[PDB]
Amino acid sequence: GAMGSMERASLIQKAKLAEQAERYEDMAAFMKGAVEKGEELSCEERNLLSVAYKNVVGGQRAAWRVLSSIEQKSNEEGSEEKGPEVREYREKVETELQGVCDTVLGLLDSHLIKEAGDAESRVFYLKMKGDYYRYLAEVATGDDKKRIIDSARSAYQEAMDISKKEMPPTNPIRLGLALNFSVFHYEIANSPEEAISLAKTTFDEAMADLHTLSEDSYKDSTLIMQLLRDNLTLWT
Amino acid sequence: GAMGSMERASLIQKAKLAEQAERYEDMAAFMKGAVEKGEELSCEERNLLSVAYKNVVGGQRAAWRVLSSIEQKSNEEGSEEKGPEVREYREKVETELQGVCDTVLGLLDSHLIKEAGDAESRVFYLKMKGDYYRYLAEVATGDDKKRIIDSARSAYQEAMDISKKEMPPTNPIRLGLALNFSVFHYEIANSPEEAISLAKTTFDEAMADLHTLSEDSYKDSTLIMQLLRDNLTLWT
Ligand SMILES: C=CC(C)(C)OC[C@H]1O[C@H](O[C@@H]2C3=C([C@H](C)COC(C)=O)C[C@H](O)[C@]3(C)/C=C3/[C@@H](COC)CC[C@H]3[C@@H](C)[C@H]2O)[C@H](O)[C@@H](OC(C)=O)[C@@H]1O
Ligand SMILES: C=CC(C)(C)OC[C@H]1O[C@H](O[C@@H]2C3=C([C@H](C)COC(C)=O)C[C@H](O)[C@]3(C)/C=C3/[C@@H](COC)CC[C@H]3[C@@H](C)[C@H]2O)[C@H](O)[C@@H](OC(C)=O)[C@@H]1O
Ligand SMILES: [Cl-]
Ligand SMILES: [Cl-]
Ligand SMILES: [Mg+2]
Ligand SMILES: [Mg+2]
Ligand SMILES: [Mg+2]
Ligand SMILES: [Mg+2]
């Protein structure tokens, strides 16, 4: 660990600076170093961890999709052989993306999830585990696609069960989990009906719980409810 | 050179793919590898080289400016001591930025400039040399600031002399060189009057040469003339 010699508090401070500078690779490395100090993460610290890797892998996924599209076009009828370069470079990006997902999943397994006892931390980390197996599933094609998909489903499902028992329907973590599990059903598991049912029931049950909330609360929950509505509008 | 085993043509192909995927670090590494094959670069290849490093260093500069601003605020009256972290992380970004500039300058010196005989290639590379010394000047503070500034001025000046002798006033490379030399005068050399004079004469002399051009030509020259006008509007 190249961050082993830096104070935990300094790593957190620098992660916040990297966020302000949109240096997300740095941000992720600082937060990895903070996790590796062995102490549990606070609510604010968990958000820094997830934002950093979301942006790193997000850029890798966007690049992979561009290259995969070029590759597919190059393998159609009437296309001129370009050689191995497109496949090679797509494989390079894919392998780097898989490495980042493996790193995140290793942090969750060593040892964030096992030490997370409160619902808000346990559901948060299990959602992340589902998210990063989902990203692996987006690029998987070999004899492991089915196992990767089931690993994502299993993590999302355990997070769902906890969130329904321990969190109100408007809790932003519960809402973001349901949004992403719904995307998993639609895009990964070939289950659009399940995706639509989950997004609708999640939206409706949150709607009916809004009356319990303060005003300047739940800006993140309003945002996420709109994303559920956006997906239902695209899917129906 | 980690690109030593890849074919030149494959490096160029992958640089174009990286551009489409907005993977500019990859793009720069592929183009560095292509330069290191020892053959001169075509017009299209020179553009790939400059776009790749422009985007890499551009992101580093934007991050450095964010951090430097935070650092300055932290060193004002009434500010709470945050410790060494802001300076440390600004120094980290600064050192990475300087390393990229050094790499580009080394490619120009080994051996792009010495083998560039045509005006369009020689002016192009000398403009790049001025640009990357300018980026070094933006962060320089020690006993080398003056020498760095003069290295930028010297490269821009030699490019200017060639461009005025060998290129029409509407040539896009000549125009972009004048635009950037004007920015050097304004932002680096504390010479706003020189910056304004250069931008105005460049604009006026290009205006008077437009009548020689074809229509679907010079989209890049129209774009650059507008940037000269934009700067004159900001500066006056
Ligand atoms: C990374 C730190 C920063 C940028 C400072 O904060 C990110 C954000 O962190 C919190 O928001 C979380 C959160 C996001 C909110 C939906 C953003 O809301 C607004 C108004 O922008 C998106 C972020 O990625 C983050 C951290 C992700 C999670 C997601 C994590 O799964 C493992 C589950 C849902 C969502 C929850 C955790 C949100 O509470 C806060 O409630 C947000 O504050 C506001 C104005 O709403 C803040 O923007
Ligand atoms: C990197 C390759 C790609 C993205 C394919 O092309 C970049 C661009 O490459 C060319 O444009 C150059 C060029 C740019 C043009 C001003 C862009 O014009 C338009 C319409 O977008 C900006 C680029 O950074 C680039 C390569 C940089 C230079 C600069 C280099 O200094 C060392 C000097 C001025 C300018 C010259 C070289 C331009 O000719 C072409 O003339 C442009 O084609 C069009 C539509 O105008 C193309 O967009
Ligand atoms: Cl590759
Ligand atoms: Cl640092
Ligand atoms: Mg300590
Ligand atoms: Mg615990
Ligand atoms: Mg060869
Ligand atoms: Mg030559």
Side-chain angles (χ1 to χ4, degrees), chain B residues 4 28 51 54 62 79 87 103 115 117 128 158 184 206:
Chain B
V51 165
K54 173 182 224 292
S79 289
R87 171 185 57 72
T103 292
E115 300 295 350
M128 284 186 70
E158 179 177 357
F184 166 85

Side-chain angles (χ1 to χ4, degrees), chain A residues 10 14 26 85 88-89 96, chain B residues 10 14 26 85 88-89:
Chain A
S10 298
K14 290 181 183 177
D26 288 347
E85 287 87 357
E88 285 170 353
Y89 184 43
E96 183 192 290
Chain B
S10 298
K14 290 181 183 177
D26 288 347
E85 287 87 357
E88 285 170 353
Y89 184 43

Side-chain angles (χ1 to χ4, degrees), chain B residues 74-76 78-81 83-142 147-153:
Chain B
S74 89
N75 280 287
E76 282 182 355
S79 289
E80 196 59 39
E81 171 62 29
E85 287 87 357
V86 170
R87 171 185 57 72
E88 285 170 353
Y89 184 43
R90 189 267 300 157
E91 283 176 354
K92 177 197 179 149
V93 173
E94 180 173 306
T95 297
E96 183 192 290
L97 180 164
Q98 290 167 327
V100 174
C101 294
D102 289 350
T103 292
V104 175
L105 290 171
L107 292 173
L108 297 166
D109 197 58
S110 304
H111 295 278
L112 291 171
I113 288 175
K114 59 165 53 72
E115 300 295 350
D118 294 353
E120 287 214 290
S121 68
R122 192 162 188 84
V123 170
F124 191 100
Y125 293 135
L126 284 170
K127 176 185 169 288
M128 284 186 70
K129 181 172 183 171
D131 287 343
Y132 284 86
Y133 273 113
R134 175 159 60 87
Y135 304 150
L136 291 176
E138 292 176 340
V139 309
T141 57
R147 261 182 282 271
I148 294 170
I149 291 179
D150 203 68
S151 287
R153 186 193 312 273

Side-chain angles (χ1 to χ4, degrees), chain B residues 11-63:
Chain B
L11 289 162
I12 299 300
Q13 184 179 174
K14 290 181 183 177
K16 293 174 183 176
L17 293 169
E19 191 276 322
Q20 296 175 256
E22 296 177 54
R23 293 269 297 195
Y24 293 107
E25 289 196 20
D26 288 347
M27 195 187 176
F30 292 140
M31 286 311 302
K32 175 173 191 286
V35 171
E36 287 172 346
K37 299 296 180 192
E39 307 244 60
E40 302 185 22
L41 299 192
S42 69
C43 175
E44 171 176 14
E45 293 166 353
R46 294 192 292 271
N47 292 345
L48 295 172
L49 178 68
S50 70
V51 165
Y53 280 106
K54 173 182 224 292
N55 275 277
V56 170
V57 81
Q60 296 172 320
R61 292 163 70 214

